[PDB]
């Protein structure tokens, strides 16, 4: 049961999260300071849109503890002293290895990391028709709710021929073939997404019947269908304003 322990420096823990989660665009790091003379650096780490954090962020980032901020003059009991308030705001747990930390993060928890503690505090705000929308943020969150691996890597980019359109690319690192990912990313950067999508309209399919350059794409409004293709080694693309996920390549036969 090989377990990697957490680093004492906050900087080291943050660099390693970024490393392990593939510097995914929806993973938020909020830096803040705690202690008497704001000497102790701390951070809130959470995945965007799969958590109700405001009350916790409000407490932490506005420093809503004081008095008792003086009771324990930080560094050693900081995390445990802070936890006494956070338990009133959500279900608190503690992680002391990467597996536990990463799984709690992927499950919509908020992580609280302090400068030199090496134990991470997890807090949960949940207790246990559904199609994609015009919002990338909402769509990413929908996939993140189904695929709970830190190996799901999200890459944001601006593609477009005349004007730029915001796009988020998805793939499961280690499952998806790197040569396939590199090729799809390369094509996207120079794709005429407007022409490609317009060629998919029923009117154009009925009359035009144009050829499709690599990669062929499949449109789905179902997050479970996106989740299934991601577990097969395919790439999911979310374009700003389009209420569906684009699976690439559409024809992908494995052996």
XYZ file of N, CA, C and O in Angstrom, residues 124-221:
392
model
N -16.601 19.281 3.223
C -17.675 18.945 2.302
C -18.942 19.770 2.583
O -19.346 19.886 3.736
N -19.592 20.293 1.521
C -20.834 21.085 1.600
C -22.067 20.275 1.041
O -23.214 20.728 1.183
N -21.836 19.060 0.476
C -22.915 18.185 -0.024
C -23.277 17.064 1.027
O -22.579 16.918 2.047
N -24.375 16.328 0.765
C -24.877 15.249 1.623
C -25.403 13.992 0.933
O -25.845 13.055 1.612
N -25.357 13.968 -0.408
C -25.812 12.841 -1.221
C -27.319 12.752 -1.365
O -27.949 11.824 -0.852
N -32.886 16.221 -19.641
C -33.136 17.209 -18.582
C -31.810 17.725 -17.973
O -31.679 18.939 -17.749
N -30.870 16.801 -17.708
C -29.525 17.077 -17.195
C -28.512 17.071 -18.328
O -27.505 16.352 -18.290
N -28.820 17.856 -19.375
C -28.031 18.003 -20.584
C -27.098 19.196 -20.482
O -27.288 20.073 -19.635
N -26.098 19.235 -21.369
C -25.157 20.330 -21.455
C -25.875 21.646 -21.790
O -26.933 21.641 -22.416
N -25.291 22.763 -21.354
C -25.786 24.123 -21.564
C -24.833 24.893 -22.505
O -23.860 24.327 -23.020
N -25.090 26.207 -22.673
C -24.287 27.109 -23.504
C -22.996 27.547 -22.773
O -22.094 28.109 -23.415
N -22.897 27.254 -21.448
C -21.761 27.617 -20.594
C -20.719 26.506 -20.486
O -21.052 25.423 -20.007
N -19.449 26.798 -20.855
C -18.327 25.853 -20.743
C -18.187 25.437 -19.269
O -18.144 24.236 -18.988
N -18.138 26.424 -18.365
C -17.983 26.215 -16.928
C -18.951 25.212 -16.345
O -18.540 24.324 -15.593
N -20.232 25.334 -16.726
C -21.318 24.452 -16.306
C -21.087 23.051 -16.880
O -21.193 22.069 -16.149
N -20.739 22.968 -18.177
C -20.475 21.715 -18.892
C -19.281 20.941 -18.289
O -19.388 19.731 -18.103
N -18.177 21.641 -17.961
C -16.990 21.025 -17.347
C -17.332 20.405 -16.009
O -16.935 19.268 -15.739
N -18.109 21.157 -15.193
C -18.584 20.757 -13.881
C -19.437 19.475 -13.985
O -19.289 18.572 -13.159
N -20.271 19.367 -15.041
C -21.120 18.200 -15.269
C -20.282 16.946 -15.483
O -20.600 15.926 -14.881
N -19.193 17.031 -16.268
C -18.284 15.910 -16.542
C -17.541 15.528 -15.239
O -17.525 14.349 -14.862
N -16.965 16.538 -14.547
C -16.248 16.425 -13.265
C -17.037 15.705 -12.162
O -16.447 15.233 -11.190
N -18.366 15.705 -12.275
C -19.272 15.093 -11.317
C -19.363 13.596 -11.553
O -19.595 12.848 -10.602
N -19.152 13.169 -12.826
C -19.182 11.775 -13.304
C -17.764 11.150 -13.272
O -17.597 10.058 -12.727
N -16.764 11.814 -13.889
C -15.380 11.314 -13.914
C -14.643 11.973 -12.765
O -14.315 13.158 -12.855
N -14.399 11.227 -11.683
C -13.728 11.782 -10.496
C -12.215 11.351 -10.391
O -11.729 10.912 -9.338
N -11.468 11.526 -11.468
C -10.034 11.218 -11.435
C -9.183 12.504 -11.579
O -9.510 13.372 -12.411
N -8.037 12.617 -10.858
C -7.164 13.781 -11.099
C -6.453 13.662 -12.455
O -5.831 14.615 -12.901
N -6.557 12.488 -13.116
C -5.950 12.221 -14.422
C -6.767 12.860 -15.555
O -6.274 12.953 -16.687
N -7.989 13.354 -15.240
C -8.802 14.089 -16.206
C -8.211 15.491 -16.312
O -8.282 16.287 -15.365
N -7.523 15.734 -17.431
C -6.831 16.989 -17.658
C -7.613 17.875 -18.642
O -8.075 17.402 -19.682
N -7.854 19.157 -18.230
C -8.606 20.208 -18.945
C -7.660 21.318 -19.421
O -6.915 21.859 -18.610
N -7.678 21.637 -20.733
C -6.809 22.575 -21.436
C -7.681 23.617 -22.110
O -8.469 23.284 -23.000
N -7.591 24.858 -21.637
C -8.335 25.985 -22.187
C -7.541 26.658 -23.286
O -6.321 26.787 -23.181
N -8.216 27.041 -24.369
C -7.562 27.703 -25.501
C -8.556 28.610 -26.242
O -9.760 28.578 -25.973
N -8.020 29.468 -27.118
C -8.763 30.420 -27.930
C -8.527 30.062 -29.375
O -7.432 30.250 -29.896
N -9.533 29.457 -29.996
C -9.465 29.036 -31.390
C -10.405 29.920 -32.198
O -11.332 30.487 -31.640
N -10.154 30.036 -33.489
C -10.990 30.830 -34.373
C -10.221 31.378 -35.549
O -9.059 31.785 -35.403
N -10.888 31.398 -36.725
C -10.301 31.897 -37.956
C -10.274 33.436 -37.962
O -9.176 34.009 -37.943
N -11.461 34.097 -37.965
C -11.566 35.570 -38.021
C -11.477 36.175 -36.598
O -10.647 37.060 -36.352
N -12.338 35.692 -35.684
C -12.398 36.111 -34.285
C -12.157 34.910 -33.393
O -12.483 33.791 -33.803
N -11.651 35.129 -32.162
C -11.383 34.025 -31.232
C -12.617 33.624 -30.400
O -13.374 34.464 -29.917
N -12.760 32.316 -30.219
C -13.780 31.627 -29.430
C -13.073 30.815 -28.355
O -12.088 30.123 -28.643
N -13.585 30.893 -27.122
C -13.051 30.142 -25.994
C -13.492 28.697 -26.096
O -14.647 28.404 -26.421
N -12.538 27.800 -25.861
C -12.701 26.363 -25.974
C -11.955 25.673 -24.834
O -10.857 26.108 -24.482
N -12.540 24.594 -24.269
C -11.864 23.761 -23.279
C -11.827 22.313 -23.823
O -12.852 21.743 -24.195
N -10.619 21.767 -23.889
C -10.267 20.419 -24.330
C -10.116 19.488 -23.098
O -9.548 19.902 -22.095
N -10.600 18.247 -23.188
C -10.543 17.226 -22.134
C -9.997 15.894 -22.635
O -10.369 15.452 -23.723
N -9.212 15.205 -21.791
C -8.681 13.865 -22.043
C -8.215 13.268 -20.722
O -7.850 14.022 -19.816
N -8.224 11.919 -20.604
C -7.735 11.285 -19.388
C -6.295 10.881 -19.659
O -6.029 9.959 -20.448
N -5.369 11.595 -19.007
C -3.932 11.346 -19.062
C -3.633 9.889 -18.658
O -4.073 9.436 -17.601
N -2.926 9.166 -19.511
C -2.597 7.768 -19.241
C -3.525 6.778 -19.911
O -3.158 5.612 -20.085
N -4.745 7.225 -20.264
C -5.733 6.415 -20.977
C -5.687 6.869 -22.442
O -5.500 6.033 -23.328
N -5.792 8.193 -22.687
C -5.698 8.742 -24.030
C -4.271 8.624 -24.570
O -3.305 8.802 -23.816
N -4.143 8.300 -25.874
C -2.850 8.211 -26.554
C -2.297 9.617 -26.740
O -3.005 10.486 -27.258
N -1.047 9.844 -26.326
C -0.431 11.168 -26.420
C -0.307 11.654 -27.860
O -0.579 12.825 -28.106
N 0.021 10.762 -28.813
C 0.143 11.127 -30.228
C -1.224 11.593 -30.791
O -1.263 12.531 -31.587
N -2.335 11.000 -30.311
C -3.704 11.363 -30.712
C -4.066 12.739 -30.103
O -4.661 13.577 -30.792
N -3.682 12.970 -28.828
C -3.953 14.223 -28.121
C -3.199 15.368 -28.819
O -3.829 16.375 -29.169
N -1.882 15.185 -29.063
C -1.024 16.176 -29.730
C -1.584 16.568 -31.105
O -1.590 17.751 -31.434
N -2.074 15.581 -31.883
C -2.629 15.801 -33.218
C -3.959 16.536 -33.188
O -4.164 17.428 -34.008
N -4.858 16.177 -32.257
C -6.163 16.829 -32.161
C -5.988 18.305 -31.713
O -6.622 19.192 -32.295
N -5.088 18.554 -30.737
C -4.773 19.884 -30.211
C -4.231 20.788 -31.333
O -4.705 21.918 -31.478
N -3.268 20.269 -32.129
C -2.640 20.922 -33.283
C -3.712 21.337 -34.308
O -3.724 22.491 -34.719
N -4.634 20.423 -34.669
C -5.716 20.685 -35.626
C -6.660 21.762 -35.121
O -7.072 22.618 -35.903
N -7.012 21.706 -33.822
C -7.921 22.644 -33.166
C -7.425 24.070 -33.261
O -8.185 24.957 -33.644
N -6.141 24.278 -32.954
C -5.481 25.574 -32.977
C -5.697 26.318 -34.319
O -5.822 27.550 -34.317
N -5.786 25.574 -35.440
C -5.956 26.150 -36.777
C -7.313 25.795 -37.431
O -7.501 26.077 -38.619
N -8.254 25.204 -36.669
C -9.567 24.810 -37.195
C -10.473 26.041 -37.402
O -10.363 27.038 -36.671
N -11.359 25.952 -38.409
C -12.407 26.934 -38.660
C -13.660 26.306 -38.066
O -14.461 25.669 -38.758
N -13.763 26.419 -36.741
C -14.811 25.838 -35.918
C -16.218 26.240 -36.376
O -17.132 25.426 -36.292
N -16.378 27.454 -36.887
C -17.667 27.958 -37.336
C -18.139 27.169 -38.558
O -19.250 26.635 -38.544
N -17.258 27.028 -39.567
C -17.490 26.283 -40.804
C -17.742 24.784 -40.496
O -18.678 24.192 -41.043
N -16.922 24.198 -39.596
C -17.018 22.809 -39.163
C -18.391 22.563 -38.545
O -19.067 21.613 -38.945
N -18.815 23.424 -37.608
C -20.102 23.264 -36.926
C -21.279 23.521 -37.859
O -22.226 22.739 -37.854
N -21.189 24.564 -38.701
C -22.229 24.913 -39.670
C -22.449 23.774 -40.682
O -23.581 23.568 -41.125
N -21.379 23.012 -41.011
C -21.444 21.857 -41.927
C -22.268 20.711 -41.317
O -22.745 19.844 -42.050
N -22.430 20.739 -39.989
C -23.192 19.767 -39.214
C -24.668 20.092 -39.087
O -25.420 19.278 -38.549
N -25.104 21.276 -39.574
C -26.521 21.671 -39.538
C -27.301 20.796 -40.532
O -26.758 20.456 -41.584
N -28.539 20.387 -40.181
C -29.374 19.461 -40.964
C -29.541 19.919 -42.427
O -29.443 19.080 -43.329
N -29.743 21.231 -42.651
C -29.886 21.862 -43.968
C -28.653 21.620 -44.859
O -28.811 21.248 -46.025
N -27.441 21.813 -44.302
C -26.164 21.604 -44.985
C -25.890 20.125 -45.227
O -25.296 19.799 -46.249
N -26.302 19.229 -44.299
C -26.109 17.787 -44.477
C -27.015 17.248 -45.575
O -26.616 16.348 -46.303
N -28.235 17.800 -45.681
C -29.244 17.437 -46.675
C -28.740 17.780 -48.092
O -28.891 16.945 -48.983
N -28.135 18.985 -48.290
C -27.703 19.468 -49.605
C -26.190 19.379 -49.890
O -25.805 18.657 -50.812
N -25.361 20.164 -49.156
C -23.906 20.320 -49.320
C -23.154 18.980 -49.406
O -22.618 18.661 -50.473
N -23.128 18.207 -48.287
C -22.476 16.900 -48.109
C -20.961 16.977 -48.366
O -20.417 16.252 -49.205
N -20.293 17.841 -47.592
C -18.853 18.092 -47.645
C -18.051 16.998 -46.950
O -18.569 16.302 -46.072
N -16.764 16.878 -47.312
C -15.830 15.957 -46.662
C -15.441 16.586 -45.320
O -15.613 17.791 -45.138
N -14.935 15.779 -44.390
C -14.562 16.268 -43.074
C -13.082 15.958 -42.819
O -12.694 14.789 -42.775
N -12.247 16.996 -42.613
C -10.830 16.731 -42.308
C -10.662 16.172 -40.889
O -11.572 16.290 -40.057
N -9.498 15.564 -40.624
C -9.162 14.999 -39.326
C -9.130 16.089 -38.224
O -8.510 17.139 -38.408
N -9.725 15.823 -37.046
C -10.503 14.634 -36.683
C -12.001 14.851 -36.891
O -12.502 15.962 -36.702
N -12.725 13.782 -37.259
C -14.185 13.827 -37.356
C -14.699 14.006 -35.950
O -14.080 13.489 -35.013
N -15.778 14.768 -35.779
C -16.281 15.025 -34.427
C -17.723 14.517 -34.280
O -18.499 14.487 -35.253
N -18.061 14.112 -33.044
C -19.386 13.642 -32.682
C -19.963 14.560 -31.597
O -19.333 14.752 -30.561
N -21.141 15.148 -31.843
C -21.802 16.034 -30.891
C -22.784 15.263 -29.979
O -23.624 14.505 -30.463
N -22.698 15.489 -28.668
C -23.588 14.855 -27.690
C -23.977 15.857 -26.619
O -23.126 16.603 -26.125
N -25.249 15.861 -26.233
C -25.721 16.742 -25.161
C -25.729 16.006 -23.810
O -26.077 16.609 -22.807
